[PDB]
RNA sequence: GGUUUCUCUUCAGAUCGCAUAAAUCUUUCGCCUUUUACUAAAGAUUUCCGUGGAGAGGAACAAUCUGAGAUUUUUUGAGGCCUUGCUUUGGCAAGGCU
């Protein structure tokens, strides 16, 4: 469902907000079955701190929120 | 199951307010749920200030409660 | 009537009339008229209703080999009673089983052809015949028609090189290339892929068996293989899908042959037809002429094919009414 | 659980549940994202070959 | 040969596999042998072009 | 005889009128329901092209 | 045509005939051979969707 | 290669522009189609195969023009090659009679024509790299390898312009100054061809003397290129040239019974079998063979007629070979409709081609 | 939440017909004192024997049947607790905590 939609839209640019407050916003390299997924050029903003541009960041289910882009129609995953 | 389908129908027809376990009270259209409560919400204003998120995906460990 | 039942019935009738002329020592021909001009029309109850009919043709069927068709092959309504086969007493649509089509396909071998594709009919097809009539040249084996329509420097002898003759087949196959003024020309089909179908004789051979008539492969640099039994041993309860299922049946090769059976014999369900509406021996003149023929039967082939092309040409889509 | 082949040679920096972030060469990993990272230096000390579990590794990135 | 000259990535699908089965009635070992020989000749042609 | 047995062995449910079909479109429908949509070609032209 | 039957839901091949979606000139239908090459742009899913 | 040549002509000269609009429409819609208008007013179309050209003519007759248009016989096109060298060290000179150019035409080697045509060797290479290519596998002299100037009628065509001139190396700066105009004259001469207006192939043009005045200027401003064209034509005339016929390669999927019938149709159409083999894993046979392109007109149709369509053949243009007849023998009698024998073939081929668009006769001293 | 079958009505645009006839008219012919009857091709229509889909009514047999209907890695306790900024009193913005 949601994991299948993330695997379908796992090439666009999205933001993953972790439970520790680390918000990695960037292109998705690949979404796995679990929440451990690799991203590309993610500007991981730390909790009340600056961002770090990581070309390869792999996530455990610490990544809680996922602000997805508009590359997903209502019947694209329905 | 049927209660989750009714909650998804109420979220599609109205503004459902889901208060997740990350203190995120989101009023808006919850697009889909899951058996592990992997919830995708379409165009929902979430208060952690109700900032609008066009599509938000949350886990069932990080979710707490929902309401119509 | 059901078309494969009717065709196999007439193939049986063909077999016994072959047997009857091959076995009867002295056939007696019949008088015409059978009754005199003073002989009145007789009463049915006084003459025919009180007496028993004599025997029909009616070959004995095999209990072993002709097993599904063994009962009802000689009925006027063979399977009209059976609800699992027909819709009921209207006798409109038939839904059948594979071994009785195999039995009827075996029984109707005399009337049926042996061709497997339209690539035998290279330029002997209806589009080629329409082209031949519309451009008014004909095959010597093909039929002839009326003309449909009733100086050039291209015909200069000092600009034309003649090496091979541009014959009828070339102008038929490429009408825009070869026939100036191509009008009402029907383009033929091109080469379909050729049917190379193995035909089995005995059921002792398997349904997946190397025919020696097929030329051998004689196949002759390593492969990217993983570690052998060092990783990924298969778990419990994994299996091929039909490992419990056996490989083949005796009716499997029968259904393989029934796939390449012709149009009234490669069907499991269909509609019954009128026996006037079924042309039985249409394939016999839709093939070419055989060898050793006199002039009269080849002219017969040409005239039968000529009226067949005329009937195919003058077909119109029917109105509502 | 599937990020071990991408960082089987390159160095990675991951933060444990203690809050310490260690950068080291991941030589091996388990199926539950328990990655044994050789020559791990935590931000300052050295942990050696450290098997950081999947639940412990909240955040991670490719350093080398 | 023209794909070798044009320098494009080529993958091969083997169509009409039912002609080995319904139309040729091959054994599975012989069908594997024919397909492996097909793969070997395509690889040899790629080697020599 | 054993076609619905094979259908349940593959986990496929079909109606009676589909079993009453002629052999070639029924076999096309069986192969379509067995292999689903075309995905190996999509992986073929994404991962290797 | 099989990809069009996958993607387009209402487009199906008939039982008697094999349709030719890319062959759109009438000369291709008359001759029974592909003549002119045809482009199709489509969205395709893999095994991972 | 679009090699099959067909003349085409409208019935109505009033509807002649309409079929010309349709000719631009079919040339627009087809990539390999070639539409030309000759000196006689005829429209010559070059195409790949008979089915392709019948489809093109069907599209022209139905969609792209509504006019019924007459079609001539399908023929092929040829090239021009030579057998022996130019027996005369032949010369021409500029219209201002100062620059005098002397050059001979000789046959090329085996692999050089296909190597230049496949662009195995390039003029875009270094001259030393080209010399190493010509010296390792073709075993040339290094002076003859550095003497090479240009390739054929077009970009990398199969003629080699060798400029090896020891009497004219005393003014090699002037020779390099006129080198470019010599190259366009050579390209134009090999583009036109003085036999029957075909492209010149497999000829090495070796320059012997170049008596050129220093700084031609006024006579160098557009007169060297027709002088070099006259040099190429005149050197081609005594170099005993031949017509060069394309051949077609035929692959036949046939049942094994009618193989002798296929051999009989090959004997009827002068074709010779490369190799017959059975198909691996199939009961049929594959026959690889070669045929003349003139004899290839519907060899597939005749084979399917003889074998009832069971044997199916596909043919392609493969290569070129020489015509065994002589084109320049004026003593050969030619019947206008009877099929000529093999020594009389090339004579008939050059007479009908010269009659097709221009003057029929041929002069060996027309330029020089 | 029956089937078979019969009748009527409506749409027949599919090879309605894996079949094939005839007639009229406009003509070209063949034949040819002339009238039907003619010969074989085209155009223009028609008729007949069939045909498909839908609906209604009737009849006989099923008389229901047929459907639908947890703790132990990452999706549940590392849970609690305090100070400063703000209290906007649900606790929020920062620190040491087990």
Q: Let me know how long chain C is.
A: 321
Residues A29 and A41: beta-carbon distance below 8 Å: no
H250-269 residues touching C, CB cutoff 8 A: 253, 269
With touching defined as 3+ CB pairs under 8 A, do chains H and G touch?
yes
| C115 vs C121: CA distance, rounded Å | 10
Is residue C116 within a helix (H) or strand (E), and if so which, with residue range? none
CATH number of the domain at A59, please.
2.30.30.100
Judging contacts by C-beta atoms under 8 Å, the chain E residues touching residue C198 are: 23-25
Closest-CA distance, H148 to chain C, in angstroms, reads: 40
**CA C4 vs CA B37, C255, C283: distances in Å:** 61, 15, 15
| C283 vs H258: CA distance, rounded Å | 24
Experimental method: cryo-EM
* Domain region containing A63: 1-78
- Bridge partners of H79? H244
Tell me how far the alpha carbon of residue C193 is from its chain's centroid: 19
The set of residues, in sequence order, having a beta carbon less than 8 Å from that of H59 and lying 6+ positions away, is G27, H26, H29
Spell out where chain C has E strands: 93-95, 269-271
The set of residues, in sequence order, having a beta carbon less than 8 Å from that of B63 and lying 6+ positions away, is B18, B20, B21, B37, B39
Full 3-state SS string of chain H: CCCEEEEEEECCCCCHHHHHHHHHHHHHHCCCCEEEECCCCCEEEEECCHHHHHHHHHHHHHHHCCCCEEEEEEEECCEEEECCCCCCCEEEECCCCCCEEEEEEEECCCHHHHHHHCCCCCCCCCHHHHHHHHHHCCCCCHHHHHCEEEECCCCCCCEEEEECCCCCHHHHHHHHHCHHHHHHHHHHHHHHCCCCCCCECCEEEEEEEEECCCCCCCCCCCCHHHHHHHHHHHHHHCCCEEEEEEEEEEEEEECHHHHHHHHHHHHHCCCEEEEEEECCCCCCEEEEEEEECCCCCCHHHHHHHHCCCCCEEEEEEEEEEECCCCCCCCCCCCCCCCCCCHHHHHHHHHHHHHHHHCCCCCCCCCCC
For B68, which DSSP code? Answer: -
Give the β-pairing of H312-322 and H241-254: antiparallel
Contact call for C209 and E25, based on CB within 8 A: yes
Tokens of H349: 């081929």
- Helical pair C250-259 and C98-107, crossing angle rounded to 10 deg: 60
Q: Which residue has the tokens 């075909």?
A: H198
- Helical pair H16-29 and H50-59, crossing angle rounded to 10 deg: 130
Q: How many domains does chain B have?
A: 1
Burial H53-77 (b: 16+ CB within 10 A, else e): bbbbbbbbbeebbeeebebbbbbbb
Binding residue per annotation — E15? yes
Considering only alpha carbons, which residue of chain C is nearest residue G16? C263
In a mutational test of the G interface, the residue from F39, F47, F49 whose CB has the highest number of chain G CBs within 10 Å is: F39
Judging contacts by C-beta atoms under 8 Å, the chain G residues touching residue H55 are: 27, 31, 35
Burial A43-73 (b: 16+ CB within 10 A, else e): ebbeeeeeeeebebbbbbbbbbbbbbeeebe
Resolution value (Å, 1 decimal): 5.9
Nearest alpha carbon to residue A42 among A56, A61, A31, A21: A56
Q: Which residue has the tokens 């071998």?
A: C109
Tokens of C143: 């039929």
Burial H220-230 (b: 16+ CB within 10 A, else e): beebbbbbbbb
For A42, which DSSP code? Answer: E
Question: Which other chains touch chain D, taking contact as 3+ CB pairs less than 8 Å apart?
Answer: A
Spell out where chain A has E strands: 13-18, 23-30, 38-45, 51-54, 57-58, 63-67
**CA H83 vs CA C188, H104, H292: distances in Å:** 46, 13, 20
Contact call for C190 and G33, based on CB within 8 A: yes
Closest-CA distance, E6 to chain H, in angstroms, reads: 13
| E1 vs E16: CA distance, rounded Å | 23
- Bridge partners of B17? B27, B67
Binding residue per annotation — E16? yes
Tell me, yes or no, if F38 comes closer than 8 A to chain G by beta carbon. yes
Judging contacts by C-beta atoms under 8 Å, the chain B residues touching residue A68 are: 40, 54-57
| F24 vs F30: CA distance, rounded Å | 10
| H189 vs H176: CA distance, rounded Å | 20
Q: Let me know how long chain B is.
A: 68
Phi (first) and psi of residue H322, to 5 degrees: -75, 150
Question: Which other chains touch chain A, taking contact as 3+ CB pairs less than 8 Å apart?
Answer: B, D, G
| C255 vs H114: CA distance, rounded Å | 55
Tokens of C42: 């007789």
For C216, which DSSP code? Answer: P
Q: Which residue has the tokens 């070796």?
A: H206
| H285 vs C312: CA distance, rounded Å | 37
Q: How many domains does chain A have?
A: 1
Tokens of C265: 């014999």
Tokens of H253: 């999927």
CATH number of the domain at B7, please.
2.30.30.100
**C-alpha angle with apex G12: A71 to C255, nearest 5 degrees?**
130
Is residue B12 within a helix (H) or strand (E), and if so which, with residue range? helix B2-13
Judged by DSSP in three states, D59 sits in strand
Is residue D27 within a helix (H) or strand (E), and if so which, with residue range? strand D21-29
* Runs of H (alpha helix) within F1-49: 3-9, 16-19, 23-35, 40-47
Q: Give the HSE-up count for residue G33: Cα atoms under 13 Å, Cβ half-sphere.
A: 12
**CA C65 vs CA C10, C61, C68, H59: distances in Å:** 19, 8, 9, 57
Nearest alpha carbon to residue H76 among H195, H246, H193, H270: H246
Judging contacts by C-beta atoms under 8 Å, the chain F residues touching residue C241 are: 9-10
Is residue E34 within a helix (H) or strand (E), and if so which, with residue range? helix E28-48
| B38 vs E12: CA distance, rounded Å | 40
The set of residues, in sequence order, having a beta carbon less than 8 Å from that of D2 and lying 6+ positions away, is A32, A34, A36
Closest-CA distance, C99 to chain F, in angstroms, reads: 12
Give the β-pairing of B50-58 and B39-47: antiparallel
- Bridge partners of H35? H45
Judged by DSSP in three states, C270 sits in strand
| B56 vs B49: CA distance, rounded Å | 16
End-to-end, the C-alpha distance of chain C in Å comes to 26
**CA H1 vs CA F11, H242, H297: distances in Å:** 55, 21, 16
Tell me, yes or no, if G35 comes closer than 8 A to chain H by beta carbon. yes
* Domain region containing B51: 1-68
Burial F9-46 (b: 16+ CB within 10 A, else e): eeeeebeeeeeebeeeebeeebeeeeeebbbeebeeee
CB atoms within 10 A of CB C21: 9
Tokens of C21: 């002329």
| H40 vs C154: CA distance, rounded Å | 12
Contact call for H73 and C166, based on CB within 8 A: yes
Nearest alpha carbon to residue F26 among F37, F11, F35, F14: F14
Provide the CA E30 to C1' I34 distance, Å, integer: 82
- Bridge partners of H277? H286
The set of residues, in sequence order, having a beta carbon less than 8 Å from that of H73 and lying 6+ positions away, is C154, C160, C161, C166, H6, H7
Percentages of chain D per state (helix, strand, coil), in multiples of 5? 0, 55, 45
Judged by DSSP in three states, C86 sits in strand
């Amino acid at each position: 469902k949601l994991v299948r939609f993330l695997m379908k839209l796992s090439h666009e640019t999205v933001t993953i907000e972790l439970k520790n407050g680390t918000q990695v916003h960037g292109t998705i390299t690949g979404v796995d079955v679990s929440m451990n997924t690799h991203l590309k050029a993610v500007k991981m903003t730390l909790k009340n701190r600056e961002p770090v541009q990581l070309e390869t960041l792999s996530i455990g289910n610490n990544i809680r929120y996922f602000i997805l882009p508009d590359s997903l129609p209502l019947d694209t995953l329905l | 199951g049927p209660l989750s389908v009714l909650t998804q129908s109420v979220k599609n027809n109205t503004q459902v307010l889901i208060n997740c376990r990350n203190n995120k009270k989101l009023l808006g259209r919850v697009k889909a749920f899951d058996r592990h409560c992997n919830m995708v919400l379409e165009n929902v204003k979430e208060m952690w200030k109700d900032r609008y998120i066009s599509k938000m995906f949350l886990r069932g460990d990080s979710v707490i409660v929902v309401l119509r | 009537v059901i078309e494969p039942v009717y065709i196999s019935q007439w193939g049986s009738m063909w077999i016994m009339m072959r047997r009857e002329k091959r076995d009867r020592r002295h056939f007696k021909r019949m008088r015409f008229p059978p009754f005199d001009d003073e002989e009145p029309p007789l009463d049915y109850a006084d003459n025919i209703l009180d007496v028993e009919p004599l025997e029909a043709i009616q070959l004995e069927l095999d209990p072993e080999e002709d097993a599904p068709v063994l009962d009802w092959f000689y009925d006027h309504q063979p399977l009209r009673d059976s609800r699992k086969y027909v819709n009921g007493s209207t006798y409109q649509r038939w839904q059948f089983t594979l071994p009785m089509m195999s039995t009827l396909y075996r029984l109707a071998n005399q009337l049926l052809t042996d061709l497997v594709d339209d690539n035998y009919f290279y330029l002997f097809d209806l589009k080629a015949f329409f082209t031949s009539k519309a451009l008014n040249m004909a095959i010597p084996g093909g039929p002839k028609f009326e003309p449909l329509v009733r100086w050039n420097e291209f015909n200069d002898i000092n600009k034309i090189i003649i090496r091979q003759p541009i014959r009828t087949e070339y102008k038929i196959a490429f009408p825009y290339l070869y026939n100036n003024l191509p009008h009402h020309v029907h383009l033929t089909w091109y080469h379909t892929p050729n049917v190379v179908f193995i035909k089995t004789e005995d059921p002792d051979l398997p349904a997946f068996y190397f025919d020696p008539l097929i030329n051998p492969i004689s196949h002759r640099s390593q492969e990217p293989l993983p570690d052998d039994d060092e990783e990924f041993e298969l778990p419990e309860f994994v299996e091929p899908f039909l490992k419990d299922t056996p490989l083949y049946t005796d009716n499997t090769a029968n259904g393989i042959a029934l796939l390449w059976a012709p149009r009234p014999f490669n069907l499991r369900s269909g509609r019954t037809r009128r026996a006037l509406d079924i042309p039985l021996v249409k394939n016999w003149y839709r093939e070419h002429c055989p060898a050793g023929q006199p002039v009269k039967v080849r002219v017969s082939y040409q005239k039968l094919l000529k009226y067949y092309v005329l009937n195919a040409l003058k077909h119109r889509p029917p109105k509502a009414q | 659980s599937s990020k071990m082949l991408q960082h089987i040679d390159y160095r990675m920096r991951c933060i444990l549940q203690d809050g310490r972030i260690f950068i080291g060469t991941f030589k091996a990993f388990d199926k539950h994202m328990n990655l044994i990272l050789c020559d791990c230096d935590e931000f300052k000390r050295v942990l050696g070959l450290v098997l950081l579990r999947g639940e412990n590794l909240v955040s991670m990135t490719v350093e080398g | 040969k023209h794909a070798v000259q044009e320098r494009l990535a080529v993958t091969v699908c083997i169509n009409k596999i039912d002609r080995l089965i319904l139309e040729l009635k091959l054994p599975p070992t012989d069908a594997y042998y024919k397909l492996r020989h097909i793969v070997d000749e395509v690889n040899g042609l790629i080697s020599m072009y | 005889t054993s076609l619905p047995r094979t259908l349940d062995e593959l986990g496929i449910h079909l109606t009676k009128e589909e079993l009453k079909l002629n052999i070639r479109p029924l076999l096309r429908l069986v192969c379509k329901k067995f292999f689903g949509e075309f995905t190996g070609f999509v992986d073929m032209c994404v991962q290797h092209i | 045509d099989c990809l069009i039957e996958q993607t387009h839901p209402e487009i199906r091949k008939r039982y008697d005939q094999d349709l030719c979606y890319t062959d759109i000139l009438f000369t291709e239908q008359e001759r029974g051979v592909g003549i002119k090459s045809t482009p199709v742009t489509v969205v395709l899913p893999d095994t991972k969707g | 290669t679009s090699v099959i040549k067909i003349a085409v002509e409208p019935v109505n000269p009033s509807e002649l522009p309409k079929m010309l609009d349709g000719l631009r429409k079919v040339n627009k819609s087809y990539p390999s189609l070639t539409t030309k208008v000759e000196e006689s007013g005829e429209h010559v179309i070059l195409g790949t195969g008979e089915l392709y050209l019948d489809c093109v003519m069907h599209d022209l007759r139905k969609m792209y023009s509504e006019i019924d248009i007459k079609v001539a016989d399908p023929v092929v096109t040829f090239c021009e090659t030579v057998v022996e060298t130019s027996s005369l060290k032949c010369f021409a000179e500029t219209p201002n009679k100062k620059n005098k150019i002397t050059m001979i035409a000789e046959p090329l080697e085996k692999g050089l024509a296909e190597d230049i045509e496949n662009e195995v060797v390039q003029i875009t290479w270094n001259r030393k790299k080209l010399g190493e290519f010509f010296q390792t596998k073709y075993d040339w002299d290094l002076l003859a390898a550095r003497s090479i100037w240009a390739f054929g009628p077009d970009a990398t065509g199969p003629n080699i312009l060798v400029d090896d001139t020891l009497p004219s190396e005393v003014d090699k700066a002037l020779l390099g100054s006129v080198k470019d105009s010599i190259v366009q004259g050579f390209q134009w001469g090999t583009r036109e061809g003085p036999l029957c207006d075909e492209l010149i192939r497999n000829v090495k043009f070796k320059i012997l003397d170049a008596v050129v005045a220093q700084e031609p200027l006024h006579r160098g401003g557009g007169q060297i290129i027709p002088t070099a064209r006259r040099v190429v034509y005149s050197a081609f005339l005594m170099a005993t040239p031949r017509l060069m016929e394309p051949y077609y390669f035929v692959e036949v999927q046939a049942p094994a019974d009618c193989v002798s019938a296929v051999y009989t149709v090959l004997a009827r159409r002068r074709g010779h079998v490369t190799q017959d083999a059975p198909i691996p894993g199939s009961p049929l046979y594959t026959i690889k063979a070669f045929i003349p392109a003139i004899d290839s007109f519907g060899f597939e149709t005749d084979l399917r007629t003889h074998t009832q369509g069971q044997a199916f053949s596909l043919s392609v243009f493969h290569h070129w070979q020489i015509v065994p007849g002589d084109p320049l023998d004026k003593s050969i009698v030619i019947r206008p409709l009877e099929p000529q024998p093999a020594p009389h073939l090339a004579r008939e081929f050059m007479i009908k081609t010269r009659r097709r668009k221009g003057l029929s006769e041929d002069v060996s001293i027309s330029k020089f």
